[PDB]
Amino acid sequence: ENFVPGLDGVVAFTTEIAEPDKDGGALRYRGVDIEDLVSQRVTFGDVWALLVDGNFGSGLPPAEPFPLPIHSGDVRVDVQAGLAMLAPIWGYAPLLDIDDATARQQLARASVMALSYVAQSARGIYQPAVPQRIIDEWSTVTARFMTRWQGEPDPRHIEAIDAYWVSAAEHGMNASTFTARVIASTGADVAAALSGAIGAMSGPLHGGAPARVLPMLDEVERAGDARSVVKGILDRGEKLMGFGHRVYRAEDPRARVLRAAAERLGAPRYEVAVAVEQAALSELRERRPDRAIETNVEFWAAVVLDFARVPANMMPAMFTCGRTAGWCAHILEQKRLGKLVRPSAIYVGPGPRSPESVDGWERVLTTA
Amino acid sequence: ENFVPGLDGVVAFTTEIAEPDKDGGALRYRGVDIEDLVSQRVTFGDVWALLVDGNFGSGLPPAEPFPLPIHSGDVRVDVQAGLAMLAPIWGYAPLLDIDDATARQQLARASVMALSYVAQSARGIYQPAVPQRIIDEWSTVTARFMTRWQGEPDPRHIEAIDAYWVSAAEHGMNASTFTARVIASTGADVAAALSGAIGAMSGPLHGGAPARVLPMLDEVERAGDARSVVKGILDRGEKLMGFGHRVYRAEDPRARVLRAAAERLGAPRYEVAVAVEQAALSELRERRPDRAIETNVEFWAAVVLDFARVPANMMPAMFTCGRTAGWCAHILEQKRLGKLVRPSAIYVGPGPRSPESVDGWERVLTTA
Numbered sequence: 001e002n003f004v005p006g007l008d009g010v011v012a013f014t015t016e017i018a019e020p021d022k023d024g025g026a027l028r029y030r031g032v033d034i035e036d037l038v039s040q041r042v043t044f045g046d047v048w049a050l051l052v053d054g055n056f057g058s059g060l061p062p063a064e065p066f067p068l069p070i071h072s073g074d075v076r077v078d079v080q081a082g083l084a085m086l087a088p089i090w091g092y093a094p095l096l097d098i099d100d101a102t103a104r105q106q107l108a109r110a111s112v113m114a115l116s117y118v119a120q121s122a123r124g125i126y127q128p129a130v131p132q133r134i135i136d137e138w139s140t141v142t143a144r145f146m147t148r149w150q151g152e153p154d155p156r157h158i159e160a161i162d163a164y165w166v167s168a169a170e171h172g173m174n175a176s177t178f179t180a181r182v183i184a185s186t187g188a189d190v191a192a193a194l195s196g197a198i199g200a201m202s203g204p205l206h207g208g209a210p211a212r213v214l215p216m217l218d219e220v221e222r223a224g225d226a227r228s229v230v231k232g233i234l235d236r237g238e239k240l241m242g243f244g245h246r247v248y249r250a251e252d253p254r255a256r257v258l259r260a261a262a263e264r265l266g267a268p269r270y271e272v273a274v275a276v277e278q279a280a281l282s283e284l285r286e287r288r289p290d291r292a293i294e295t296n297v298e299f300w301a302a303v304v305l306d307f308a309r310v311p312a313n314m315m316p317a318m319f320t321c322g323r324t325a326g327w328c329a330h331i332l333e334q335k336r337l338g339k340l341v342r343p344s345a346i347y348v349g350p351g352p353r354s355p356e357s358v359d360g361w362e363r364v365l366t367t368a
Numbered sequence: 369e370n371f372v373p374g375l376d377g378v379v380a381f382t383t384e385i386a387e388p389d390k391d392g393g394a395l396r397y398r399g400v401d402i403e404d405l406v407s408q409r410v411t412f413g414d415v416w417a418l419l420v421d422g423n424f425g426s427g428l429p430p431a432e433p434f435p436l437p438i439h440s441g442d443v444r445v446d447v448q449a450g451l452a453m454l455a456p457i458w459g460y461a462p463l464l465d466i467d468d469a470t471a472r473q474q475l476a477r478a479s480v481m482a483l484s485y486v487a488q489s490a491r492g493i494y495q496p497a498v499p500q501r502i503i504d505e506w507s508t509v510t511a512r513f514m515t516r517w518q519g520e521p522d523p524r525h526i527e528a529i530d531a532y533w534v535s536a537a538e539h540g541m542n543a544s545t546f547t548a549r550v551i552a553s554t555g556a557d558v559a560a561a562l563s564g565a566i567g568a569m570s571g572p573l574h575g576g577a578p579a580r581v582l583p584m585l586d587e588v589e590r591a592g593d594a595r596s597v598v599k600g601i602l603d604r605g606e607k608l609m610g611f612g613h614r615v616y617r618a619e620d621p622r623a624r625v626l627r628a629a630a631e632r633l634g635a636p637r638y639e640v641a642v643a644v645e646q647a648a649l650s651e652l653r654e655r656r657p658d659r660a661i662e663t664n665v666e667f668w669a670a671v672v673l674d675f676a677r678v679p680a681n682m683m684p685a686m687f688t689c690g691r692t693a694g695w696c697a698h699i700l701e702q703k704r705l706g707k708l709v710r711p712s713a714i715y716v717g718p719g720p721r722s723p724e725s726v727d728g729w730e731r732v733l734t735t736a
Contacts, residue, residue, distance in 0.1 A: 005381055006707040012375050016717030031718040032726065040723060046732055056728030070449070074456045080560070081438070081449035084567065088442045094572050173713045175554050179547055179564060186543050186571025192448070196547060196564035199452065203554025204462050205708050339374040340573050345541045349384030350399040355408060358400065360424030364414055 001346070012341065013181065017051055017329045018170045025250040029170060030054055037166050038257045044165040045141045048111065048325040051170055052104065052332060060141050063112040065132055068120040075317040076202045078121040079114050084195040086110055095335050096187040103335055106190045107328040112141060114194070114324055118317045119149035145321075150309070156265050157308040161318070163261040164304050167254045167297075168319055170326025176200040180327045184334040185341040193331050194324070201320055208298035210305060211312035213241040216276070217302075223275035230279040234287070242299030243280050246292045258300035267307040273300070369714070380709065381549065385419055385697045386538045393618040397538060398422055405534050406625045412533040413509045416479065416693040419538055420472065420700060428509050431480040433500055436488040443685040444570045446489040447482050452563040454478055463703050464555040471703055474558045475696040480509060482562070482692055486685045487517035513689075518677070524633050525676040529686070531629040532672050535622045535665075536687055538694025544568040548695045552702040553709040561699050562692070569688055576666035578673060579680035581609040584644070585670075591643035598647040602655070610667030611648050614660045626668035635675040641668070 018029045027034045029051050037047055045060035069085065070078045086092065092106055120129070135147045142162045146153035173181075180197035184190070201207065216233065220226045233240060262270050277295055284293040305315050355361055386397045395402045397419050405415055413428035437453065438446045454460065460474055488497070503515045510530045514521035541549075548565035552558070569575065584601065588594045601608060630638050645663055652661040673683050723729055 001379070003379055005705065007375070007378065007380050007709055007711045010375065010378055010711050011369070011371055011714055012711035013373055013713045014716045015713045016715070019715040019717065028720060030726070031721040032723050033720070036723050040732075041736070042723070042732055050726070055726050056732050058728075070453065072453045072456045077452050077456055080452050080563070084445050084448050084452075084563075085438065085440045088440045088445055094570075096572055173711060175550060175708060175710055178709075178711060179550050182543060182547050182550070183564070183568045183571065185573070186568050187573040188567060188571035192567035192570055195448070195452075196551070196567040199556060199560035199564040200551045200554050202462075202560055203551065203556035204464055205553070205555040206710075337373065340543060341375055341546075342543055342574075343375045343378050343380035343541060343546060345381045345383045346379055347384070347387040348382045349387065352396060352401070353399040355400050355404050355410070358398070358418070358423050360426075364408075364410055364424050368409070 007343070012178070013173065013334075013337070015173070015330070015333060016054075017326070017333060018172065020172045022247070023249045025248050025253055027171065027253045034167055034253060035257050035260075038163045038261060041159070041162070042166070043140045043142060044162055044169070044322065044325070047166045047169055048108075048141075048328070051325045051329040052107065060108055060112055062136075062141070062144060063116040066113060066116060067129065068117050070117075071121075071125055075118060075121045075314060076198060076320070079117045079317070079320065080195050080198040080202075082117050083110060083114055083191050083198070085191075086113065087189045087191040092189040092191050094187050094189050095184060100332065100336065103190060103332055107194075107331060110191055110194055111324045111328055115141065115145050115321050116148060118321050119145050122311075122314050122317065123149050146308075160261060160265055160267075160304050160308040161310075163257065163265075164301065164308075164318065165322030165325075167257050168301075168322035170323070170329065171254070173330075174201075175203065175206060176323065177326060177330050181330050181334040182341045184331045185337075185339065190328075190331055194327060197327050198320055201323065202316070207316070207319065208296055208301075209241070210298045210302035210315045213299050213302045214306055214312065216241055217269060217273060220272050220276055223271055226272065226275035226279040227282075230276065230283050234283055240280050240284065242296050242302070243284060243293060244296055246294040247296070248294075249292075251294050252297045255295055255297040255300050258297065258304050262300060262303045262307065265307065267303055269303050269306065273303045375711070380546070381541065381702075381705070383541070383698070383701060384422075385694070385701060386540065388540045390615070391617045393616050393621055395539065395621045402535055402621060403625050403628075406531045406629060409527070409530070410534070411508045411510060412530055412537070412690065412693070415534045415537055416476075416509075416696070419693045419697040420475065428476055428480055430504075430509070430512060431484040434481060434484060435497065436485050438485075439489075439493055443486060443489045443682060444566060444688070447485045447685070447688065448563050448566040448570075450485050451478060451482055451559050451566070453559075454481065455557045455559040460557040460559050462555050462557050463552060468700065468704065471558060471700055475562075475699060478559055478562055479692045479696055483509065483513050483689050484516060486689050487513050490679075490682050490685065491517050514676075528629060528633055528635075528672050528676040529678075531625065531633075532669065532676075532686065533690030533693075535625050536669075536690035538691070538697065539622070541698075542569075542691075543571065543574060544691065545694060545698050549698050549702040550709045552699045553705075553707065558696075558699055562695060565695050566688055569691065570684070575684070575687065576664055576669075577609070578666045578670035578683045581667050581670045582674055582680065584609055585637060585641060588640050588644055591639055594640065594643035594647040595650075598644065598651050602651055608648050608652065610664050610670070611652060611661060612664055614662040615664070616662075617660075619662050620665045623663055623665040623668050626665065626672050630668060630671045630675065633675065635671055637671050637674065641671045
């Protein structure tokens with residue numbers, strides 16, 4: 001026929017959750033801009049509630065003691081499997097059989113427990129757990145995350161993560177968000193939908209690699225040698241990590257608030273990171289002025305996460321931790337919609353044949 | 369705008385795997401009809417290879433010893449989590465980094481291991497495992513499944529499962545198949561895509577409940593009292609399990625081969641099940657002749673699975689076991705496509721506002 005495969009540009013839903021204005025250079029959760037939410041130090045628990053409920057009514061409850069049962073050596077796999085396992089032990093009914101208030105409570109409980117699992121998986125099995133009495137000294141979900149992970153958290157490192165999670169909470173109908181909405185549309189339990197979205201998020205096609213810009217930033221020692229290093233990397237036929245074709249028509253507003261938070265909090269890498277950004281951006285727009293070249297959000301996400309002592313293998317899990325807010329918001333919205341997401345396909349394969357006309361049919365009879 | 373939410377009737381892919389002819393009353397895997405595949409006693413391992421590879425070249429290798437690590441009390445959850453955990457231990461690279469031959473080998477290894485996990489989870493933890501030397505006495509994947517599950521399998525019970533799995537291997541772009549194709553389109557590992565599809569399959573909206581027709585069949589003792597029982601169930605305002613609006617224009621060809629296999633193998637429930645089918649079908653078309661009423665595939669799937677001593681809580685897992693053939697076929701096809709499945713959405717929510725104009729903003733400042 002006359003169609004392009006991939007559902008590209010096909011409107012699948014109508015949402016009231018968030019609006020990514022790509023030509024206006026803005027990201028608004030329920031109408032509120034993300035810069036307002038970050039600059040006012042609104043914690044992740046409230047932005048979770050704002051995205052899901054639609055207002056600042058009631059935030060996120062604290063997680064319950066639950067030692068992580070999965071130790072696969074992959075933080076993604078640990079939270080993906082551990083989330084699916086919550087339905088039997090906690091008695092999660094399918095979305096068909098529960099009302100909206102029950103689904104919200106189940107989503108908030110699974111969200112806050114995924115954060116507990118990531119902090120436990122990151123801390124590792126070769127270290128004893130942080131006592132729950134120490135974790136309870138803090139009152140926010142992010143502070144408790146750092147305490148369960150590191151033990152004695154630094155408040156500036158908590159503010160960096162609260163800023164990163166808020167800027168990563170929701171960004172439209174990503175493939176993981178679509179997967180969560182599809183699984184939820186079949187009536188399954190909320191834990192089955194969250195677990196499936198994590199599998200989609202683990203895909204490297206869409207996400208960016210924040211841990212790949214850190215080596216380049218380690219080469220440059222002062223703001224001066226940034227131009228020469230960017231010169232050598234481009235002259236050696238390699239690529240510049242953190243820069244490419246624009247996503248928004250101007251810059252990404254998420255890269256805005258991340259860079260601003262890195263400056264406000266006083267990240268040591270900020271002086272060198274700024275010099276590298278202009279040294280890059282300059283070189284790329286001179287070597288190919290025909291393309292719109294901007295700084296990807298992964299560039300300043302690396303500066304913020306590295307400032308909070310987040311290792312390389314932990315950065316992909318830090319994204320998933322914040323993205324649970326948008327996932328639960330779309331799961332609950334998909335529940336109220338009440339429509340199974342079911343596309344169609346066209347057969348272009350072989351016509352009707354007999355089993356004898358298929359190659360290898362002799363092996364079906366020889367080794368029957 | 370002027371659109372209906374739900375991606376209904378939107379062609380998303382073009383497949384060469386299988387063709388569900390709904391008006392011609394036929395289901396063909398790569399052009400071969402399912403009745404030919406079942407009547408010729410072609411084992412599930414070959415139909416797996418035919419759907420994935422496109423011919424009868426090389427079938428399914430046997431599973432390796434691997435005690436199931438997940439005991440959640442839900443067979444679905446056990447295979448969903450255990451499949452995701454295979455990537456770290458087995459070194460499954462993302463789909464982006466592996467070639468087609470590697471993806472096929474990884475898919476065949478994860479498929480055959482999911483069958484091992486289901487047989488282990490069904491057998492239960494309160495029973496010692498079947499020795500591997502006993503399992504190795506059999507040469508087909510289905511016979512080894514029954515041996516790992518029951519110990520000493522009955523060949524007629526193996527033929528029933530081989531017939532059921534072949535008829536359940538693939539049926540178009542089901543929401544689980546879509547979920548598998550979406551997750552695979554992000555470049556993730558094959559284990560992450562299979563694990564996500566299982567979460568979608570667990571949804572009760574699309575699948576049917578085979579274990580719900582067994583109680584009705586237990587009431588009717590001879591072929592005679594079938595009409596009276598169907599009379600009482602309809603007169604008591606209840607519903608008739610296993611009958612409803614048609615899926616195919618005539619009958620489902622899957623219900624055809626399942627009923628035929630139940631007759632060919634000599635299922636004890638066959639005489640009563642036939643009488644109940646006509647007693648039902650008669651009553652429904654007389655009480656409402658305006659609708660096309662047919663026997664759902666779940667009705668004869670229950671007779672076949674119950675004949676093979678499959679309990680009620682195990683029947684949903686038996687479907688997933690056979691559906692892995694279609695899942696792997698679409699995962700490998702999605703890999704060769706090379707296009708991220710990414711739809712679009714329209715914001716209809718609140719416009720740009722200030723954080724102070726949101727309800728509950730006082731609680732953000734009071735409990736800051």
